[PDB]
Design a protein around this ligand. Structure first.
Ligand SMILES: CCCCCCC/C=C\CCCCCC(=O)OC[C@@H](O)CO
Ligand SMILES: CCCCCCC/C=C\CCCCCC(=O)OC[C@H](O)CO
Ligand SMILES: CCCCCCC/C=C\CCCCCC(=O)OC[C@H](O)CO
Ligand SMILES: CCCCCCC/C=C\CCCCCC(=O)OC[C@H](O)CO
Ligand SMILES: CCCCCCC/C=C\CCCCCC(=O)OC[C@H](O)CO
Length: 505
């Protein structure tokens, strides 16, 4: 077997793109606090910074749906990646050019979310269909390299970019990733004559959505349709969220609508799924049933993303008020996660998991996902006490946030490295694209909670609850989020026992 000569041009493109993304995302929260949002009072500024960051993340893990659609329906993967990558480049440029204008900076974030998210499903799979049956032995080695560039990039970008921002300002700190991103596209363009382009996939008339549409619109004799009522309810509810945009916010409102719609339509279709058998194959309707069960699984995982994504926003804010060295910047703590990932992932699989299995435990992939959410919630118990403990008294940053990072990352390996691969085995191969699409929306919805948390916290009724606790609002939210994960981890274990009673033995 020989290495396809196109692979180096994709690994190289990925390397630069992953460096440029983590490069500007990891100094995004510091930049908002020190520079762009200075017109906001300090106490107020922390809440506005989180909104900007997490509204950005939301778009990053929402726009894969647009990207995958454009590639499959019209222009193909190569051409879609190329033009989304150029837009991605422009977005990075906007961040430098409109350094001092808020409207212009938000616009650049949008283009980055559009470019980075749009090419996220396309690039990895595009790399995949460059291997034939003879090559396939090497494909696993190629995707291994992908994994390395993610961590390599996220590690060094967390170290170098805070320093670059400190010494040179935003224009240089945001321009260097932009330069890097342009080189990323050049590498991808340099192998255009080499790439293998798979023929456009034929649309499935028995796909996930056509079955859903059948389950709602098909009328059975002498009965009503509860399912379609729920759909209309979600349509009504979404409208109630869309109208309340002035309170919620634009990105928060659009997600609330999206969640309510897909939430109520999904519920309604489940009630009436047997009606779909009239218009669709038995194997195809059964598959949708398999996916709908995975949906509930993913929904309970969303509080994990709420805690894991806040390390680049909330956790940085806390590190600002801790005891750090002269050379050290609070944003450099983010480098701990890729380091811990590359340590725990070989540790667990080789040393720890067989050691827990030696005790006798099964260690089902479903058992690990539930444990990971709890440990992630546990990590925020530690983050919460620290805030309490440092409300009066001073604790150093560099030693102390190593513990929450150790627990957070350990929960990430249990959940994030297990979820999608497990769901693939649970549903028919045809649903692989549908499963992947809801997995990325899982991250989006998780960050929606972060958005809705500090929206509800500004309401009069909630403040008095905070007043009664006699706790700092900052610390109160953390414990809320800690309990948010523990509760979901409980319900997860409750649903997981019913889940394994279903499809097979
Ligand atoms: C599900 C559909 C929603 C997708 C929206 C895509 C968003 C991508 C980038 C947005 C960046 C701009 C963020 C600014 C913002 O919302 O600020 C929040 C507010 O609290 C302060 O102005
Ligand atoms: C400012 C310029 C930055 C340029 C450097 C960025 C990254 C450059 C190269 C990244 C790594 C390329 C390795 C490719 C490779 O050998 O893949 C394996 C092949 O399949 C086997 O030979
Ligand atoms: C039909 C596109 C509508 C989508 C609306 C929102 C997205 C905004 C910009 C998407 C950019 C599309 C990139 C792909 C592309 O332009 O391919 C062009 C072909 O290569 C032309 O031969
Ligand atoms: C009180 C709910 C708070 C909001 C949570 C997020 C969204 C909620 C539900 C969306 C995803 C679940 C819908 C799919 C579904 O009903 O599957 C059911 C299966 O048929 C199980 O038998
Ligand atoms: C949650 C299941 C029912 C959703 C009905 C459609 C609602 C309209 C917009 C909500 C956003 C989610 C779109 C669904 C989706 O991810 O489709 C996946 C495709 O099958 C992927 O190839």
């Amino acid at each position: 077997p020989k290495w396809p000569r196109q692979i180096p041009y994709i690994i190289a493109s990925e390397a630069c793109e992953r460096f440029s993304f983590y490069g500007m995302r990891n100094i995004l929260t510091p930049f908002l606090m020190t520079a762009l949002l200075l017109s906001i009072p300090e106490e107020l500024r922390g809440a506005v910074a989180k909104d900007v960051f997490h509204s950005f993340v939301i778009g990053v893990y929402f726009f894969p749906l647009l990207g995958g659609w454009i590639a499959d329906r019209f222009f193909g993967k190569y051409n879609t990646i190329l033009w989304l990558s150029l837009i991605y480049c422009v977005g990075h440029a906007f961040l430098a050019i409109f350094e001092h204008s808020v409207q212009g900076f938000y616009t650049g974030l949008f283009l980055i979310a559009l470019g980075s998210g749009g090419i996220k499903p396309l690039v990895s799979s595009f790399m995949g269909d460059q291997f034939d049956q003879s090559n396939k032995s090497l494909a696993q080695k190629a995707f291994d390299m992908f994994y390395f560039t993610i961590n390599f990039g996220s590690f060094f970008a967390s170290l170098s970019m805070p320093l670059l921002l400190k010494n040179f300002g935003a224009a240089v700190a945001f321009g260097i990733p932009g330069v890097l991103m342009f080189v990323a596209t050049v590498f991808f363009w340099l192998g255009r004559k080499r790439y293998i382009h798979m023929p456009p996939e034929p649309k499935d008339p028995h796909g996930f959505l056509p079955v859903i549409r059948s389950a709602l619109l098909t009328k059975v004799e002498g009965k009503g349709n509860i399912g379609l009522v729920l759909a209309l309810i979600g349509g009504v509810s979404a409208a109630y969220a869309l109208v309340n945009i002035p309170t919620l916010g634009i990105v928060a409102g659009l997600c609330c609508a999206m969640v309510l719609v897909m939430g109520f339509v999904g519920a309604g279709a489940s009630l009436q799924l047997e009606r779909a058998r009239k218009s669709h194959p038995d194997a195809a309707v059964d598959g949708v049933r398999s996916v709908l069960r995975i949906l509930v699984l993913f929904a309970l995982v969303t509080p994990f993303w709420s805690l894991f994504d806040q390390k680049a926003s909330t956790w940085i804010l806390q590190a600002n008020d801790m005891v750090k060295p002269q050379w050290f910047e609070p944003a450099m703590m983010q480098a701990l996660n890729p380091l811990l990932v590359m340590l725990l992932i070989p540790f667990n699989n080789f040393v720890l998991y067989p050691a827990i299995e030696r005790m006798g435990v099964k260690l089902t992939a479903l058992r690990k996902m539930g444990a990971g959410i709890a440990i992630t919630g546990l990590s925020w118990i530690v983050v919460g006490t620290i805030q309490l403990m440092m409300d009066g008294g001073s604790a150093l940053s560099i030693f102390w946030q190593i513990l929450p990072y150790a627990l957070l990352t350990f929960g990430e390996v249990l959940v994030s490295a297990t979820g999608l691969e497990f769901a693939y085995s649970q549903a028919p191969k045809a649903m692989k694209g549908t499963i992947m699409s809801f997995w990325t929306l899982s991250v989006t919805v998780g960050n929606l909670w972060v958005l809705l948390a500090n929206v509800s916290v500004k309401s009069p009724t909630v403040t008095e609850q905070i007043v009664q606790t006699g706790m700092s609002v900052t610390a109160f939210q953390m414990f809320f989020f800690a309990g948010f994960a523990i509760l979901a981890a409980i319900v997860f274990a409750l649903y997981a026992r019913s889940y394994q009673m279903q499809d097979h033995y």
